[PDB]
Design a protein around this nucleic acid. Structure first.
Lengths: 101, 145, 138, 109, 56, 117
RNA sequence: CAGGCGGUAGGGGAGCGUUCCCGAUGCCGAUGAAGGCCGACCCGCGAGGGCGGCUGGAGGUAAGGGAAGUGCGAAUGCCG
RNA sequence: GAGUGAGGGCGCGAGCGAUAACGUCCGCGUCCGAGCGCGGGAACAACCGAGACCGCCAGCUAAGGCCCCCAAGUCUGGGCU
RNA sequence: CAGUACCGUGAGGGAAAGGUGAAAAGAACCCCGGGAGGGGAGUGAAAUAGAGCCUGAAACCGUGGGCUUACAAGCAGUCACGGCCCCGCAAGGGGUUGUGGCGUGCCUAUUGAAGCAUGAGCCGGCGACUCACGGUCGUGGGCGAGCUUAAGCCGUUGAG
């Protein structure tokens, strides 16, 4: 049964133990345990109880596992000789893992 | 080098408004004056000839230089004679050293100086000493009063 | 990556039209539903469709003020002369092609708008020549 | 195994181009027959070629007549020469001359 | 006449797919073993109805 | 003093080859043509790194009309329903619940128009 | 943390490669330097830089700062 | 230490020109130009809304939109056409 | 082997063209064979070392290989998904297009451009603000009411 949340304008839904991308945030590499806030839940079997929010008291659950990868980009325009080249955008990446709510 | 004197017309020509054998293309013709004999000759006086050698060696003394000023090595001519003055003086392969002695005896003596300088009159070879250390002088007089 | 992609859609079948259906006005509605739009499993690259029939395809509720008031503008002149025909004649000649005009008027485009079209029998039977699913919906 | 050749001519690979996408496929015999009597220059050259490979292929590499199929070939350009010809208002209609360099091969059935 | 442009090897071979290699036929001749083209004359099987090559 | 080109031009024209060499035929065989097509595979690759966003956006939305057209009602309308009352999101994409099990979002659609009585 | 952020000319800040200097009676190198085909790993925001294989067959130059015919799509340019 | 007197389009104003012109000569204001890189405009620098670096299968909203070729009621009354 | 080829009436105008290896030690022999050109084989560290012989790229040239094409509107690349053959146990990494949204290029010139207004046959290579001395305003700076020496005489492998 699924589940969803936003890591700053990025909404995702993970089964039991998936993960691949979501930019990143601090907190030392793979060994630490953390968790933010949820939306309503996930589907299958018998869910269907969202309402006003629910993001209070409770919350979702997910483990940690940093691998930190710099991801290339490739920038360029082009008009009347103004083709400002040479510019990539490293940016972050995370390969962690998740659990329950 | 007086060129062949122009060429083909212009308006028409062999397709190319241009026709002066100034040779703006031949690999060896009408380029630019990068070099020019005068390689710009600039220089100065003793205002710094002194001050400079001072701090250096003075710092090189904060590491230990030596100074003898005047002495005997042996037959002031043979290579390994002065060798008897290398292992009996202290110095040996590593730090690199320099020294000044105005006697022509030491001249035809020091010949090839592998590790050091060997001088005669009044130059200024701090160059190699910068990347080195050890030294000796010819009287406080020669350094110049 | 919530792909969504339908993965092997596989078309449906249907029937429509009566001697009182509004030509053109309703045509827009066939295409938007022919593309398989109403099928969730959807990615505007996977050409699906609802195999269509359109019986009673003549005299089909002749809209409002169209009689001797709407002209057909197509077929470019090769010398200086082209083609025409308006309501009262075309409407009653080659009836199939007759309503399909207001249709052919707009349409989508590209190989996709084609494959999709094919499924569109028309006339004024009813009864279509290859009986395969007729779930009519007015 | 079966090594032929074709080099040091004074004409174009495009004249032989046909003399390539026609022989490849059929066996040694099929082509030898065909091309021999398919004149128009090319023919009387690709001949001595099927023989040079033939002599050694069954001299050093050891093979046989009917077991050496026509694998395929190869067809490319080569050197030139400078010549000129008269014309127009004392002009200069000028060019060279395109020569040939191309390979041929057979094999063991 | 006299146009402004280079060339595309594209249509080059697309107009000479037709050029092709068309083979010259080969007909029968028993005896030794001939298989000589339209009405040819050679020693291979020679023939049997003329006066031109050897028949031993 | 004797400094003249040599090989440097090849460095600053070789990237040109590789980073392209997969386009047409000409736009991949002349340093300049590639040069220019990199500018296009540039203003377009960047225009399609700009595209993908404002393309997938719509593809989801109308599908959301396809969940409600068969489940009762339409898009815009059901939207407000929720937003005013309680929680607000579902993200125009996540509603991909559309393909993976339906009756789900059915419950919530009715939750939207609930705020009208 | 507020801030700023297209930007032709233009005038400011850095740096980037690239040939001759000294460090070279220093050091890598036939258990390959120079050249070159391949790369979809490592850094540069880029300028570029590395690194590895393979072809290739005698030289190259640290850190460093010292000079600068150089930074080349073209100009119906010049040459092949 | 530079660039710059070929600018104009628009609008009000205004002399001019036959309230004749994507014209002239201006004051001014502004946009381009330098913002052919948004968006509308069907397509299109100078008209309204909009000022630029990332990543985005993120949310509001301004111009401008809710039958088709592409998207958000063929909404709701009311009449007039 | 160039002031030679060549041109010029004369006057004169004026050219491309360096390079096997350490050693030619330079292919003997036999088979295709016109002499040519080939092949084994040999001298040989290497004949992708062989005589338009160093290493040898680019415009160009196809044999063979894989992805692809006959319902079709194209500055031509792009990105979306998806499909087909290669490596990665894997997660996915390729190639290339299928539909489709996207698609007015460029170097000048300019109130004004995408551009049937210039130029660009195409690739390689060569290609243009330095320097002299002088002047100006800044900069790291030494000394500082003081602050600098021109050409020479000696010395200088070389320095002074």
């Amino acid at each position: 049964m699924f589940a969803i949340v936003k890591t700053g304008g990025k909404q995702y839904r993970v089964e039991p133990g998936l993960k691949l991308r979501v930019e990143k945030l601090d907190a030392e590499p793979g060994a630490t345990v953390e968790l933010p806030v949820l939306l309503l839940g996930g589907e299958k079997t018998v869910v269907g109880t969202p309402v006003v929010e629910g993001a209070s008291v409770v919350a979702e659950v997910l483990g940690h596992g940093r691998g930190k990868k710099i991801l290339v980009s490739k920038f360029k325009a082009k008009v009347q000789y103004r083709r400002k080249k040479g510019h990539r955008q490293p940016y972050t990446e995370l390969l962690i893992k998740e659990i329950r709510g | 080098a007086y060129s062949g004197r122009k060429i083909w017309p212009q308006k028409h020509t062999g397709r190319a408004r241009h026709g002066d054998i100034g040779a703006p293309i031949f690999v060896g013709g009408g380029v630019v004056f990068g070099p020019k004999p005068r390689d710009y000759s600039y220089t100065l006086p003793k205002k710094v000839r002194k001050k400079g050698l001072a701090m250096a060696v003075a710092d090189r003394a904060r590491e230990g230089k030596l100074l003898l000023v005047e002495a005997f090595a042996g037959v002031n001519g043979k290579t390994k004679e002065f060798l008897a003055w290398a292992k009996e003086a202290g110095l040996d392969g590593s730090e690199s050293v320099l020294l000044v002695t105005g006697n022509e005896l030491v001249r035809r003596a020091a010949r090839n100086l592998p590790w050091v300088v060997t001088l005669a009159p009044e130059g200024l070879n701090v160059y190699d000493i910068v990347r080195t250390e050890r030294l000796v002088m010819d009287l406080d007089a020669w350094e110049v009063f | 990556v919530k792909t969504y992609v339908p993965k092997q859609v596989e078309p449906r079948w249907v029937l429509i039209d009566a001697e009182g259906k509004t030509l053109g006005r309703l045509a827009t509605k066939i295409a938007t539903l022919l593309r398989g739009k109403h099928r969730p499993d959807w990615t505007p690259n996977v050409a699906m469709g609802d195999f269509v029939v359109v019986v009673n395809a003549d005299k089909i509720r002749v809209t409002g003020k169209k009689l001797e008031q709407k002209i057909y503008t197509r077929y470019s002149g090769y010398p200086g002369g082209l083609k025409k025909i308006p309501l009262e004649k075309m409407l009653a000649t080659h009836p199939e092609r007759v309503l399909e005009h207001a249709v052919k008027g707009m349409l989508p485009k590209g190989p996709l708008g084609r494959r999709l079209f094919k499924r569109l029998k028309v006339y004024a039977g009813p009864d279509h020549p290859h009986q395969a699913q007729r779930p009519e919906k007015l | 195994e079966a090594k032929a050749i074709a080099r040091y001519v004074r004409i174009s690979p495009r004249k032989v181009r046909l003399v390539v996408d026609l022989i490849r496929g059929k066996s040694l015999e099929e082509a030898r027959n065909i091309l021999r009597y398919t004149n128009k220059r090319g023919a009387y050259f690709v001949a001595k070629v099927l023989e040079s490979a033939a002599a050694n292929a069954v001299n050093n590499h050891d093979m046989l007549e009917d077991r050496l199929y026509v694998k395929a070939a190869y067809v490319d350009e080569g050197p030139a020469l400078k010549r000129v010809l008269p014309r127009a208002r004392g002009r200069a209609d000028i060019i060279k001359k395109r020569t040939s360099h191309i390979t041929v091969i057979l094999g063991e059935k | 006449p006299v146009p402004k442009k280079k060339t595309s090897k594209a249509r080059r071979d697309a107009r000479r797919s037709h050029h092709a290699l068309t083979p010259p036929i080969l007909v029968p001749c028993p005896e030794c073993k001939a298989m000589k083209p339209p009405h040819t004359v050679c020693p291979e099987c020679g023939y049997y109805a003329g006066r031109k090559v050897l028949e031993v | 003093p004797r400094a003249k080109t040599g090989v440097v031009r090849r460095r600053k024209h070789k990237k040109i080859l590789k980073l392209a060499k997969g386009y047409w035929g000409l736009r991949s065989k002349s340093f300049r043509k590639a040069r220019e097509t990199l500018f296009a595979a540039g203003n377009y690759a960047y225009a399609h790194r700009k595209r993908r966003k404002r393309d997938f956006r719509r593809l989801w939305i109308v599908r959301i009309n396809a969940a409600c057209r068969q489940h009762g009602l339409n898009y815009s309308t059901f939207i407000h329903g929720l937003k005013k009352a309680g929680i607000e999101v579902d993200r125009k994409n996540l509603a991909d619940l559309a393909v993976r099990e339906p009756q789900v979002f059915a419950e919530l659609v009715e939750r939207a128009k609930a705020a009208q009585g």
